[PDB]
Design a binder for this molecule. Structure first.
Ligand SMILES: [Zn+2]
Ligand SMILES: [Zn+2]
Ligand SMILES: [Zn+2]
Lengths: 49, 266, 65, 46, 48, 114
């Protein structure tokens, strides 16, 4: 616990001390422009791609 | 008997107050440590989640489930899964608990460790029953459901020690004190004016004779006579925390003797 | 955001004592100090566990989802 | 219990294909959520 | 033919899928918001 | 993510033996036993008990790094006394001490009420 370090009770940690949740959201949209050709959401396979 | 000595001051379902005489400091401390970490218990260590339409997240709930106390009386007659010959778990190495809960009432529905149900074949051993001490008989508030809220889960409780996870901790805090008068000068009381006036006297001071100022310091004196209090969580009864403590320690000393025997050939 | 099962510090099961704590305060019109004591939470690590608990679960349950 | 999407507004258990648009069938809210896998997750209770 | 535009999970990060929103935009675009949940336990060099 | 498994504290590794008895280079009739997957629970207790033997010239244990569960035990005894025999006796006494404590606690517990 030297030079601005600290010791923690691994036992307390197990019991739930300072435990946090972490959520992160990922976003996407189907295309921006193309009156005929439009981007699509799908599981991709081969198809020359 | 002959060696270390006992005097049980207080005895309850969850607390032992005792005096350990004719013991070296190391032994009292080692036994204190072993009670804290090395005694096996059974705790939830796998949660299969089918439905969780609750406020709380799957793992948050799973976390609590591990902390829920479970009958570990007959724990020595249940294998560690790691040693079990089965592929995964079985009736010899694990206990399966099920939890199904749905918000029936308009009023907030509560989920208790009592609401957990053993599905495993216990084969007549006092194991896996969730520990209830609650007057009202509910024990542990796992979760709270509202209305359309459902929580369907399965859980396998396995054998383990607090050293791997504190959820297998069979004891709470363990009170430990030797030499309440500081006749050994094992500590140096910090003060402003007077150590005696400034430091609160110990409960255990009435168990030892006071120093007597008109006497010099005892140099050959040694740390022997300990005022310990063991508190159980309820997984195992108090006596067993100390008996299994004593045992587990001797068990692991014996393994060392055994290892010397093993390496003594090839 | 639920009464933790077990005191972080010592491990004493505190998860069963919440409802009971709230009843001692409301029904028995007791003060926190005596209420905590009546629930046998003797060491300060255990007293803080309950004394300091914010039970957000209730506010969360207030949303319909 | 074969699910696809749940209405984020009224909890309606919907199920639609790309060429049938978003929106809830009798609720009309343009939200929608994915419904938990039947894959089933395991957790160490640690 | 096609060209990939698929969105991988943060290289370093990992967890469980929490909620998946499928919705339309102001300009009628199919758009998604994908939430990933991780429990973060107090590890070694964590700041307090 | 870089944290080891918790069983690594007590479960022996691949190959890994419990004790390794190396001869001390700096002193005659001295030895260094490395106890693998052990802490101050055993460490202290064994060292402390070795000090009770009037034939043990030196005894001391140490855990070079907290991360790893293993301690080193240096033992030096008088001529014609194998430190392995010193450690053997030490352990043997410890069990008999605990054996007594076990029956003693039990005896008292059965005289108790509540
Ligand atoms: Zn098995
Ligand atoms: Zn506590
Ligand atoms: Zn709707």
């Amino acid at each position: 616990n030297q030079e601005d370090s600290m010791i923690m009770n691994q036992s307390s940690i197990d019991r739930g001390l300072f435990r946090s949740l972490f959520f992160r959201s990922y976003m996407d949209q189907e295309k921006k422009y193309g009156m005929s050709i439009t981007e699509t959401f799908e599981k991709p396979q081969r198809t020359n791609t | 008997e002959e060696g270390p000595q006992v005097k049980i001051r207080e005895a309850s379902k969850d607390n032992v107050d005792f005096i350990l005489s004719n013991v070296d400091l190391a032994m009292a401390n080692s036994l204190r440590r072993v009670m804290i970490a090395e005694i096996p218990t059974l705790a939830i260590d796998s949660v299969e989640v089918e439905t969780n339409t609750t406020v709380l997240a799957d793992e948050f709930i799973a976390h609590r489930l591990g902390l829920i106390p479970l009958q570990s009386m007959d724990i020595e007659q249940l294998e560690y899964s790691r040693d079990c010959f089965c592929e995964d778990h079985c009736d010899k190495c694990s206990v399966v608990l099920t939890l199904q809960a749905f918000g029936e009432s308009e009023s907030t529905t509560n989920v208790y460790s009592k609401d957990l149900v053993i599905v495993s074949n216990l084969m007549g051993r006092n194991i896996g029953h969730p520990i209830i001490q609650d007057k009202e008989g509910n024990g542990v508030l796992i979760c709270k459901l509202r209305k359309g809220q459902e929580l369907k889960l399965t859980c396998v409780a396995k054998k383990g020690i607090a050293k791997e996870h504190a959820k297998w901790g069979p004891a709470a805090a363990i009170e430990f004190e030797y030499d309440p008068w500081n006749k050994l000068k094992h500590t140096d009381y910090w003060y402003e004016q007077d150590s005696a006036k400034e430091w609160p006297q110990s409960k255990n001071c009435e168990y030892e004779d006071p120093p007597n100022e008109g006497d010099p310091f005892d140099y050959k004196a040694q740390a022997d006579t300990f005022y310990m209090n063991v508190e159980s969580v309820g997984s195992i009864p108090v006596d067993q925390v100390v008996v299994r403590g004593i045992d587990t320690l001797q068990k692991k000393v014996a393994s060392i003797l055994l290892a010397l025997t093993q390496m003594d050939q090839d | 955001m639920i009464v933790p099962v077990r005191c972080f510090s010592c491990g004493k099961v505190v998860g069963d004592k919440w409802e009971s704590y709230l009843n001692l305060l409301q029904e028995d019109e007791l003060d926190e100090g005596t209420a905590l004591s009546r629930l046998g939470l003797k060491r300060y690590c255990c007293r803080r566990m309950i004394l300091t608990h914010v039970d957000l679960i209730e506010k969360f349950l207030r949303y319909n989802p | 219990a074969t699910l696809k999407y749940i209405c984020a507004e009224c909890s309606s258990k919907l199920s639609l294909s790309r060429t049938d648009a978003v929106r809830c069938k009798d609720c009309g809210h343009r939200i929608l959520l994915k419904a938990r896998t039947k894959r089933l997750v395991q957790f160490e209770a640690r | 033919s096609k060209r990939d535009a698929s969105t991988p999970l943060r290289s370093t990060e990992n967890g469980i899928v929490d909620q998946v929103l499928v919705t339309t935009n102001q300009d009628g675009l199919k758009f998604v918001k994908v939430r990933v949940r991780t429990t973060k336990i107090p590890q070694i060099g964590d700041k307090f | 993510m870089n944290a080891p498994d918790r069983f690594e504290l007590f479960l022996l590794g691949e190959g890994e033996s419990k004790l390794k008895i190396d001869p001390d280079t700096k002193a005659p009739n001295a030895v260094v036993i490395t106890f693998e997957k052990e802490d101050h629970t055993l460490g202290n207790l064994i060292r402390a008990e070795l000090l009770n033997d009037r034939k043990v010239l030196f005894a001391a244990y140490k855990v070079e790094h907290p991360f790893f569960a293993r301690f080193k035990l240096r033992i030096q005894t008088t001529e014609g006394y194998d430190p392995k025999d010193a450690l053997k006796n030490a352990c043997n006494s410890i069990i008999n001490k605990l054996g007594a404590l076990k029956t003693n606690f039990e005896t008292e517990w059965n005289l108790q009420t509540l």
